[PDB]
Amino acid sequence: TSGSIINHANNLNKVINHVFADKPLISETMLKILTIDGTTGKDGYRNWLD
Amino acid sequence: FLTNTTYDIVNNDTIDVLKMKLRNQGWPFVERYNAVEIDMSVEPLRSPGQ
Amino acid sequence: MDVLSKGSLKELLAHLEKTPLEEAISYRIGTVPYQNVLISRNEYYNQLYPDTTSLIDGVSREGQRNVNGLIMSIISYVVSGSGHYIPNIGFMLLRRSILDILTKHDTGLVTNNLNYGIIARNLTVSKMNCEQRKRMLICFKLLAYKDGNQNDYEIYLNQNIPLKQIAPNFIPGDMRTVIHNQDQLAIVGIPAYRLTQSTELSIRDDNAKSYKLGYVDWYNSNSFLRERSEFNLIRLKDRDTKYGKLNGW
Amino acid sequence: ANRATSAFLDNPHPVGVNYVDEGSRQFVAVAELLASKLIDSSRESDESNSDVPFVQAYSKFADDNPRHLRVKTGGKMANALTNVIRSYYSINAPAIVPQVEIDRLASKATVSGDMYNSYAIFNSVPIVEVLSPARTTVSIVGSDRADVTMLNTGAGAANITFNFGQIAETVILKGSVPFQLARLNQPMPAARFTYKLRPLDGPFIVVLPVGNPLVISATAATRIQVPLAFNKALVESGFQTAMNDGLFDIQNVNYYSSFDEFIISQYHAQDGINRVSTCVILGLALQAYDQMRRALPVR
Amino acid sequence: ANRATSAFLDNPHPVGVNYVDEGSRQFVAVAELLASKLIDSSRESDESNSDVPFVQAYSKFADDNPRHLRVKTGGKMANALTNVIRSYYSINAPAIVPQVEIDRLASKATVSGDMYNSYAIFNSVPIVEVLSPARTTVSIVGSDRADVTMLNTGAGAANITFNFGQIAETVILKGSVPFQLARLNQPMPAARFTYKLRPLDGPFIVVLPVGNPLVISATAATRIQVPLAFNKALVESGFQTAMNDGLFDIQNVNYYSSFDEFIISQYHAQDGINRVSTCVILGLALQAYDQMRRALPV
Amino acid sequence: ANRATSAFLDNPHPVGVNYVDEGSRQFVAVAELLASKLIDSSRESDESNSDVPFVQAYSKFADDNPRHLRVKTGGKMANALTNVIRSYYSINAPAIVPQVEIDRLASKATVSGDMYNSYAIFNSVPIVEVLSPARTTVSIVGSDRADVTMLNTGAGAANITFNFGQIAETVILKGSVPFQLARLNQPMPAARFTYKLRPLDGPFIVVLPVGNPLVISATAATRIQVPLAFNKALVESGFQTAMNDGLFDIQNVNYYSSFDEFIISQYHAQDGINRVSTCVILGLALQAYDQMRRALPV
């Protein structure tokens, strides 16, 4: 349903913004693995959480 | 491109014949994939909903 | 569905040339043709709705194993979209096209004893609409030309006044007559009126509306061939041509 | 000798031979799945005070948007399901649903047409025949629990032969008073209240003493292969609904009080292995019918 | 002549006339919805090894947090649900629940309260009258399946009249041996095991030959409009639970084996269509009672 | 004097004395929870086009990834569950699965081993004895609904004593014709169609007039403490599957038509309370057996 997809997309962005704010929840070692393909750290974490 | 032929040679070939030629060479992408229908609703507000 | 969409004599005969006999024959058991039955129509009535099943319904029925049943299955396919259950006809006959059966002696089928009046009565010509009667008369003329029974076809038209008025005008051996013909033979098509997803009372009307609604879906489906946008992708053998001639015509 | 048989086992009318292929089996499964969404959406509409969930599910089921002043009946899908149900019951019922309509409706939802994934237990008690001597009376009543009342008026003890068929798996016999039962050409055991029997063991002999009548209560259980979506409660409710609406009113057909009786009666007839396959599809169709009418009622 | 009637059809007691309005109907629907969540939350609490899902469900239902040293009773909602069940059964019940209390409990969730959105099939067989001539004995046993045993002692065959009422939709008759049955002023058909009948089609005559007794097994189906949340399995459990708890113990009332017999008996009483609406609301309340008491035993 | 008794109450066999500890109760609770998810994962898998929900559910249950070309029996959990059902039914059945294996399978999910939180209603009628005078015939048929047919051929009216035990909570008596019933050493009331009785009140006396036989239909309701996950529909299906699969076939045991007859018979035995406790654990195991076997038919 469109409502479920819209709700999930907005909630996913809100969580990602909060986890990366201030001191990031996940370490730099994980970000290196997720960014090895050229994607940004925020983008790589968002896909993996999904 | 992949089986080293020309358009005139394969002009009269059917879909199943073309699928066999590509699959033998090692190409698996020979199928169309049906999309998934996502159900959508517009909240009524002033007008009736859709 | 595809056979019901053809709207001109040229398209109908062209489709019959490329369609084998096995499409006319159905392999589903169906039911016996002439029976008084009660069906359920809950959109209109709470009680069961009486009706009589027939051979020109869109659903397969059981058919006689004789040659009469085979011709009656061909006509029902043309006018209703489905045939009847006549199994074990044979590979040699089933691989031939519908036009070859109706027009050619080399098939090995003998049909000179057929009576057009009995065939019409068994097919319930009274229940047929104008397009359905025109399509059946095309089948009769092709059979008459094959058997050299042109005189008998004309006399049968003289006995039936309504059939004479709507009788299509074409010589079954000349292609020039088919191109000139302008009779509209379409049973399904794009509707100018308002077409709704509603049921019909009778078996024939309800089954016909299913094909009409299915054709609309088929028209917008990916299987439909759009001549305006994809004419170059069609194969040359089956591409539309102005100088299109049936073999031997 | 006198012969007594269960009422529901007598003369099973032939079942339909149409709409039993894979394409039709997919259509019935699709209808059952969509009918379940229809009944759940109506619950959601009640809890949300909004008609959007119900209109959303009715559109998928009926391919049409509900409009006021027009009665909601289920659209073309309801027409196909109701008429296909009639054909399954009797061979005299007409087949009036085109193949184009079945194929279109079967494509609405993705689902398997498998009707042999799981199993179910049916409790009808098959008593094919009870053979008794001249001076005895035997009466059989009931289907789920069969009570056989036997009275002996002769001078000596009589032997009653019980035939439970070959299809049922287990039969449990309970008596009002202790009684003796044994297989053919087997010594009689001591009097007992209860007996657990295998119908394949053979005809069973009961000693009926002279005096007060002896009543034997019979319970049976049989296993029939059914799809995973099968729900016995929903199937039974649909069977009574189809009877009330008159879909089963066909010439030269037999009427049963429950779907349990109907499926067991067809199983015990000749070519019953082929009949029981058609009955399973009918049960799933009746489950879809039950959920469809409860969502869209008529006064 | 002799007359035989079903035991459960005799003397239906008057039902309550309170808590049948729109506001009270919503409260019963609210209780059913919140009671179902109590059962589901307890299952979730057991699986997740956390009491947090149960605490939320109990707080919504009882307006108070669960406590280890206080008995879990369901709060004021449980008391109101218990009292309305007493009122529905009989007109002599107190019916003391205030309207302000009922209205506040219907605001805990939003439900329509409509009791005509669906239907349910009831299996009780109503034999209003079996009329038998002299020298014949007729006995009626059972409600869900009615067995009629008839003996002909006289010289010749006897005609027996069956009356199934005008409410039941269909009736199936099965016999131990083939028998003849026909409507009034109709020719008798050949003997057969099974008859399907419409109760509205007048009384039915059964030919009873002299000799061994003939036993007829009767099954009937009746459709009564019920709300969409109606569940016959849960209603039946609640009916048995309410009797054991003493909720139906009032003076000058009749007792039934099941809610099936209760609703059909009230339907067949004079002006019985008045009572059938109240009985459906009682059934829904019993459905809430069963789920709530199973989750919070006392 | 003649004595008549219910068939299913006669000679209850001893039940098993193993797998009744806290760790064993956890295993049954785990098996029911994981088997329920197996039946739900099958429906979710069919709704979508992925076998992932079933693969996760089967992997947890069977400790092995499902593979094609294999029967999918259920792993060690299915084997252990089958053997404990055998042990519960009879004390003669061996106890095969070790306690270490039970504890290992109990750690797969975190669920409480409590089996007496909720309750359930069982409707078997326990007619322990019916005492009748010399010139009267009494016959008892049925378990769910017990029909007692009595005929008096004597000169005068006869008094018949009914004993329903002390376990049943309520008993509803319905007669073919109105009859008189009263407690011991108590006056008889006017003839009534129906009676509601508490079996603990005492033995009851029924007046049997001379003439046509009188048939009394009895229905009972006994409440038994069970886990909250208990479902009567699932338990009864598993009981039939258990008997059909031949795991109740042990020397010197008694067989029953339903689980309801089994549990009421054990309740009326010598150590009724202790016997019922084991049977409730058997009921939950049977519920898990039904769900597991319907998903994985072998």
Side-chain angles (χ1 to χ4, degrees), chain E residues 197-259:
Chain E
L197 295 174
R198 266 193 42 221
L200 248 172
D201 271 9
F204 304 100
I205 289 330
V206 176
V207 175
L208 187 63
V210 295
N212 279 27
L214 165 65
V215 197
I216 288 194
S217 289
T219 63
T222 319
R223 266 186 300 190
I224 290 163
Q225 285 156 129
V226 298
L228 247 174
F230 204 80
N231 191 292
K232 284 199 50 89
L234 295 172
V235 171
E236 276 314 318
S237 189
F239 197 86
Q240 300 291 318
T241 308
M243 271 205 298
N244 298 4
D245 286 310
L247 299 199
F248 294 161
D249 287 3
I250 325 160
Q251 280 240 356
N252 281 281
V253 310
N254 240 356
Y255 299 104
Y256 311 86
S257 305
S258 82
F259 181 81

Side-chain angles (χ1 to χ4, degrees), chain F residues 137-218:
Chain F
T137 88
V138 170
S139 152
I140 315 187
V141 196
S143 295
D144 44 17
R145 195 192 80 228
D147 308 305
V148 196
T149 318
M150 35 201 45
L151 177 76
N152 190 17
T153 62
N159 280 340
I160 305 166
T161 317
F162 282 64
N163 180 36
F164 292 109
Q166 283 85 49
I167 291 99
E169 274 133 33
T170 206
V171 165
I172 306 282
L173 284 195
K174 291 226 182 54
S176 41
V177 291
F179 63 105
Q180 324 193 231
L181 164 140
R183 266 150 43 82
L184 221 33
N185 327 300
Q186 291 285 315
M188 296 282 186
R192 193 173 343 144
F193 258 110
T194 176
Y195 288 80
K196 165 174 153 181
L197 311 164
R198 176 173 334 196
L200 198 40
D201 286 341
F204 307 102
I205 304 280
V206 187
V207 162
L208 184 64
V210 185
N212 289 337
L214 160 70
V215 187
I216 309 193
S217 315

Side-chain angles (χ1 to χ4, degrees), chain E residues 134-139 149-154 160 208-209 211-214:
Chain E
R135 275 133 30 212
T136 76
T137 82
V138 164
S139 164
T149 320
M150 334 172 210
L151 218 34
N152 204 351
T153 284
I160 307 196
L208 187 63
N212 279 27
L214 165 65

Side-chain angles (χ1 to χ4, degrees), chain F residues 6-24:
Chain F
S6 302
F8 76 96
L9 282 183
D10 184 1
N11 226 55
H13 64 276
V15 281
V17 284
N18 282 290
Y19 309 129
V20 288
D21 51 278
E22 191 67 57
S24 293

Side-chain angles (χ1 to χ4, degrees), chain D residues 63-116:
Chain D
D63 276 349
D64 203 344
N65 192 31
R67 250 203 57 182
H68 300 284
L69 275 192
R70 297 178 82 103
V71 193
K72 291 139 193 53
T73 53
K76 296 212 108 183
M77 176 93 96
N79 216 251
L81 192 71
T82 307
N83 285 301
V84 163
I85 276 161
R86 301 193 25 113
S87 324
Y88 283 151
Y89 198 69
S90 155
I91 220 162
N92 309 316
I96 68 148
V97 189
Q99 248 306 327
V100 287
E101 198 65 13
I102 288 267
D103 289 345
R104 174 175 74 74
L105 295 164
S107 88
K108 280 185 174 188
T110 206
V111 81
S112 46
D114 41 18
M115 306 279 159
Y116 311 98

Side-chain angles (χ1 to χ4, degrees), chain C residues 109-135:
Chain C
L109 193 76
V110 193
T111 57
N112 38 6
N113 47 283
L114 267 39
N115 191 263
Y116 303 138
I118 298 207
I119 289 164
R121 192 195 299 244
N122 297 344
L123 283 165
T124 75
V125 61
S126 44
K127 296 208 187 5
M128 288 186 176
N129 61 77
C130 209
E131 274 83 6
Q132 280 185 316
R133 301 154 106 113
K134 295 198 226 161
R135 284 182 171 230

Side-chain angles (χ1 to χ4, degrees), chain C residues 28 30 38 41 61 207 210, chain D residues 18 21 76 79 86 95-96:
Chain C
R28 256 165 279 277
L38 290 153
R41 290 296 189 263
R61 302 278 176 230
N207 289 9
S210 315
Chain D
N18 277 284
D21 50 351
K76 296 212 108 183
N79 216 251
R86 301 193 25 113
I96 68 148

